[PDB]
Design an enzyme around this catalytic site. Structure first.
Site, PDB file in Angstrom:
ATOM      1  N   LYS A 127       2.339  11.798  -3.910  1.00  0.00           N
ATOM      2  CA  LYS A 127       1.112  10.516  -4.908  1.00  0.00           C
ATOM      3  C   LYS A 127       0.462  11.425  -5.253  1.00  0.00           C
ATOM      4  CE  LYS A 127      -2.194   6.505  -3.536  1.00  0.00           C
ATOM      5  NZ  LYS A 127      -2.358   5.574  -2.638  1.00  0.00           N
ATOM      6  N   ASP A 156       1.067  -1.442  -0.333  1.00  0.00           N
ATOM      7  CA  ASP A 156       0.636  -0.008  -0.145  1.00  0.00           C
ATOM      8  C   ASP A 156       0.689   1.391  -0.132  1.00  0.00           C
ATOM      9  OD1 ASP A 156      -1.714   2.202   0.908  1.00  0.00           O
ATOM     10  OD2 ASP A 156      -2.586   1.454   2.997  1.00  0.00           O
ATOM     11  N   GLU A 184      -7.673   0.496  -4.436  1.00  0.00           N
ATOM     12  CA  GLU A 184      -7.500   0.231  -3.587  1.00  0.00           C
ATOM     13  C   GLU A 184      -8.632  -0.025  -2.508  1.00  0.00           C
ATOM     14  OE1 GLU A 184      -5.860   4.123  -1.885  1.00  0.00           O
ATOM     15  OE2 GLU A 184      -4.160   3.566  -2.713  1.00  0.00           O
ATOM     16  N   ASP A 202     -13.221   5.173   3.599  1.00  0.00           N
ATOM     17  CA  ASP A 202     -11.701   4.846   3.282  1.00  0.00           C
ATOM     18  C   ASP A 202     -11.727   5.713   3.642  1.00  0.00           C
ATOM     19  OD1 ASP A 202      -9.028   5.181   3.156  1.00  0.00           O
ATOM     20  OD2 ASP A 202      -8.799   3.349   1.365  1.00  0.00           O
TER      21      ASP A 202
HETATM   22  N1  LIG Z   1      -6.005   5.469  16.798  1.00  0.00           N
HETATM   23  C1  LIG Z   1      -6.207   6.528  16.157  1.00  0.00           C
HETATM   24  N2  LIG Z   1      -7.246   7.148  16.020  1.00  0.00           N
HETATM   25  C2  LIG Z   1      -7.193   8.010  15.299  1.00  0.00           C
HETATM   26  N3  LIG Z   1      -7.152   8.147  13.735  1.00  0.00           N
HETATM   27  C3  LIG Z   1      -5.883   7.471  13.473  1.00  0.00           C
HETATM   28  C4  LIG Z   1      -5.731   6.408  14.601  1.00  0.00           C
HETATM   29  N4  LIG Z   1      -4.920   6.042  13.784  1.00  0.00           N
HETATM   30  C5  LIG Z   1      -3.700   6.275  12.799  1.00  0.00           C
HETATM   31  N5  LIG Z   1      -4.740   7.979  12.300  1.00  0.00           N
HETATM   32  C6  LIG Z   1      -4.828   8.507  11.657  1.00  0.00           C
HETATM   33  O1  LIG Z   1      -4.567   7.670  10.303  1.00  0.00           O
HETATM   34  C7  LIG Z   1      -4.030   8.782   9.726  1.00  0.00           C
HETATM   35  C8  LIG Z   1      -3.399   7.801   8.175  1.00  0.00           C
HETATM   36  O2  LIG Z   1      -4.139   7.140   7.971  1.00  0.00           O
HETATM   37  P1  LIG Z   1      -3.828   5.804   7.014  1.00  0.00           P
HETATM   38  O3  LIG Z   1      -5.375   5.172   5.920  1.00  0.00           O
HETATM   39  O4  LIG Z   1      -3.054   4.647   7.645  1.00  0.00           O
HETATM   40  O5  LIG Z   1      -2.415   6.680   5.654  1.00  0.00           O
HETATM   41  P2  LIG Z   1      -3.084   7.097   4.072  1.00  0.00           P
HETATM   42  O6  LIG Z   1      -4.324   8.038   4.563  1.00  0.00           O
HETATM   43  O7  LIG Z   1      -1.917   7.750   3.907  1.00  0.00           O
HETATM   44  O8  LIG Z   1      -3.276   5.692   3.639  1.00  0.00           O
HETATM   45  C9  LIG Z   1      -3.623   9.946  10.256  1.00  0.00           C
HETATM   46  O9  LIG Z   1      -4.310  11.008  10.303  1.00  0.00           O
HETATM   47  C10 LIG Z   1      -3.407   9.290  11.573  1.00  0.00           C
HETATM   48  O10 LIG Z   1      -3.071  10.059  12.741  1.00  0.00           O
HETATM   49 MG   LIG Z   2      -5.117   4.877   2.252  1.00  0.00          MG
END
Ligand SMILES: Nc1ncnc2c1ncn2[C@@H]1O[C@H](COP(=O)(O)OP(=O)(O)O)[C@@H](O)[C@H]1O
Ligand SMILES: [Mg+2]
Length: 379
Positions: free
Chosen positions: A70, A9, A174, A197
């Site tokens: 990205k 990913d 995705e 998502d």
């Molecule tokens: N327990 C949690 N509660 C709230 N937000 C979270 C938690 N764990 C991760 N996040 C948030 O998720 C976001 C990242 O999302 P993710 O889906 O892992 O990455 P991307 O969006 O790059 O694919 C960050 O803003 C992070 O702060």
């Molecule tokens: Mg993502």
């Protein structure tokens, strides 16, 4: 020979690598023990930094620390989105042969890197993580992209793979990867799947149909500028106000102080997904003065409710574009790190008249998980 094919990913804010080996799919932690890795690259006088180390030093080196690549990959410089995006990026973006590219200092001299090259650095790290995990070379991968990515963007992601020494056998959507993770490919009937998502930078909703193992992307919507980082910023603004009220020091134009606030704001937010209240503390924040605040879940929800509610509009749009009702949705797949927020889950469930979303798979990891499952078929 494909060898052991890995799943990646390659996310806007975080990247995740996974592999299926002997009946089990696992997500692979980096050298710092983190199961996800910031999609960051930093260029210093000594060091090309990738991941956690790059994100950690961002405030000290903002002109040479690259993130959100990205948002630029596979696009042209004169694209409306690119022009909007480069206004909010602290590093230099230049027009190189009609395409956006980053300009940094490497030796003490200007160096230009394509989004393919930057993404390739991140993919190379994911590969190296997998190579240690397996104790073998890795040469092939399945890499995920947003459903709305076009051929240029998909090819650029493949090209990033090539730079990293990876033959990207499949570019996979995705939301489809997430659905595959949950085994929704194996249905004995027809199903309509909503994939919600909410990540770090972007929000995506997709309707997928599944029939005898065949997926189709029926409708997509969302907000490319709505994610966890925006929720952090609302906390940041409250902390600026509080510290100014208490100590007469306004940190609005202090980038290093703002970065410290951003870091602690994200920590507080994460805590409030499982706790009702949390302490936000920075020792010797500005001029030897400690920052010491408290944030409740109720306040965090209050500050972000409008942004949370904004996510329901694209969900409505997807159902309208596909011509389906809420009751026609068989599965709601909750993925993305921000979906850990209780209020987000509450609002989605109440929108679908009490229907429980599937969230059993780690939402940070479900996309990479599904990528690795598909990769396993190729191994
Ligand atoms: N327990 C949690 N509660 C709230 N937000 C979270 C938690 N764990 C991760 N996040 C948030 O998720 C976001 C990242 O999302 P993710 O889906 O892992 O990455 P991307 O969006 O790059 O694919 C960050 O803003 C992070 O702060
Ligand atoms: Mg993502």
């Amino acid at each position: 020979n494909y060898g052991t094919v890995i799943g990646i990913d390659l996310g806007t804010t975080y990247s995740c690598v996974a592999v299926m080996k002997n009946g089990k799919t696992e997500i692979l932690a980096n050298e710092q023990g983190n199961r996800i890795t910031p999609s960051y690259v930093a260029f210093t006088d000594d060091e090309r930094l990738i991941g956690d180390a790059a994100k950690n030093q961002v405030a000290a080196n903002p002109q040479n620390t690259i993130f959100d690549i990205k948002r630029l990959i596979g696009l042209k410089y004169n694209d409306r989105s690119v022009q909007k995006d480069i206004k909010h990026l602290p590093f230099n973006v230049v027009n190189k042969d009609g395409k956006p590219a980053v300009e940094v200092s490497v030796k003490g001299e200007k160096k230009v890197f394509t989004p393919e090259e930057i993404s390739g650095m991140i993919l190379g790290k994911m590969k190296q993580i997998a190579e240690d995990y397996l104790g073998t070379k890795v040469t092939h991968a399945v890499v995920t992209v947003p459903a709305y990515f076009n051929d240029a963007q998909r090819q650029a992601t493949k090209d990033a793979g090539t730079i990293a020494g990876l033959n990207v056998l499949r570019i996979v959507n995705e939301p489809t990867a997430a659905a595959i993770a949950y085994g929704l490919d194996k249905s004995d009937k027809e199903h309509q799947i909503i994939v919600y998502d909410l990540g770090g930078g972007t929000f995506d909703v997709s309707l997928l149909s599944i029939e005898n193992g065949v997926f189709e992307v029926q409708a997509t919507s969302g907000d490319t500028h709505l994610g966890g980082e925006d929720f952090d910023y609302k906390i940041v603004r409250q902390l600026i106000k509080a510290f100014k009220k208490k100590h007469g020091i306004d940190v609005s134009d202090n980038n290093k102080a703002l970065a410290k606030l951003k870091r602690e704001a994200e920590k507080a937010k994460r805590a409030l997904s499982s706790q009702m209240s949390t302490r936000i503390e920075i020792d010797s924040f500005v001029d030897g003065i400690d920052l010491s605040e408290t944030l409740t879940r109720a306040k965090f929800e209050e500050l972000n409710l409008d942004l949370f509610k904004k996510t329901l509009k694209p969900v409505e749009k997807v159902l309208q574009d596909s011509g389906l009702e809420k009751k026609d949705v068989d599965d709601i797949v909750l993925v993305g790190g921000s979906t850990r927020i209780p209020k987000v889950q509450q609002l989605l469930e109440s929108y679908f008249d009490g229907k429980k979303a599937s969230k059993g798979i780690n939402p940070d990891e479900a996309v990479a998980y599904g990528a690795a499952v598909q990769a396993g078929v190729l191994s």
